[PDB]
Structure formats: C-alpha cells, structure tokens
Amino acid sequence: SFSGYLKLTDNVYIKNADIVEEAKKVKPTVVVNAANVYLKHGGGVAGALNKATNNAMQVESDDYIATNGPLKVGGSCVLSGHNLAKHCLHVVGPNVNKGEDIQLLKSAYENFNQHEVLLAPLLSAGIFGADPIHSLRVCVDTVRTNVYLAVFDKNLYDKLVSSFL
C-alpha cells in the first residue's frame, strides 16, 4: 500500500513524491489527474500522467470529449487508469491563470468523496496558479475519504507541512 506518508489529519496524508512514480509503484485504485475541461493533458501533472500512459490517456480522453463534451470547472469524470491505476479521476480545479473562480476549488475536491481512497495532487496548484497552502486547507476541510497527496516539489512539500495548522 502507500508508504512514507506524513499523516496530516484522520484522512489526509502527504508525501514529497512524483505522482507518476508513486502511481507506478502503488498501482492505486484511483489516481487523480489535475485535468482541464477539455481533458487536454499537455503539461503539469496531466502531461506527466499522460506521457506515462504512452498517450493512451489522451486517446481515451479525446473519445470521451467527442461523446460528452467538456467537463465543468469543479467537475470530474472517471476514466481508465491505464498502467498507473485501476481508474483515473480527472478533476478540474479552477485555473487562476484563466480568471476562474477560486471558490470552485471546494467543488473540485468534493469529487474525491465519491472514492474511498485516492492518490492525488493538490488541485489548482502548480501551473493552475492557486496558492498550494490554500489548496491543502480546502482539501483537508472538504475531503472525507482517504487521500494520499503527492507533492512533487520538496521545497513546497516542506512549506506545506511546516505551515499546516
């Protein structure tokens, strides 16, 4: 199972880890992708997860969008986890660099409550432009299921743990 995580709360755990390497190691039931509404996995966590699937995640995602249309900001969809997980929960957090409402971050985290255990990144963090300290606070105050957070950057991981109230 998950190893080397620091326990933040009853149900939230955190580790300084590459979420692709973590997923390939654990092969969790659910890996969360930091998706956009179009499921265009170009960069950040989405680009890294997609590249690990040899683009199979993008091929599957384009078929999903062709059939269903784009997701909503704050929404999600369950697709295959390919070689990384049983399932991938593609969750759209608000992209602050697109003027999207930061209040949608709580709605985005609510998607995690439909899964008993998840491997996930901090939503809206990184290239999505939100404050990762704020994302972690919304995560612990919204998610009730067991969430194992992988934070890629060591310096950000240390800042998140040392400032966690």
Ligand X SMILES: CC(=O)Nc1cc(Br)c[nH]c1=O
Contact region for ligand X (CB under 6 A) — 5-13, 16-24, 62-70, 96-104? 16-24
How far apart are the C-alpha atoms of 121 and 8, rounded to whole Å? 15
Interface pick for ligand X out of 81, 93, 94, 121 (rule CB under 6 A)? 121
C-beta separation of 92 from 35 below 8 A: yes
Q: Which residue, 107 or 124, is less far from ligand X as judged by CB? A: 124
**CB within 8 Å of 22: residues ≥ 6 apart:** 15, 119, 148, 150
CB 18 → ligand X: shortest distance, Å? Answer: 4
Nearest to 72 by CA among 42, 126, 36: 36
Q: Binding to ligand X by residue 45, rule CB under 6 A?
A: yes
CB 15 → ligand X: shortest distance, Å? Answer: 12
* Binding interface with ligand X (CB under 6 A): 18-20, 44-45, 47-48, 121, 126, 152
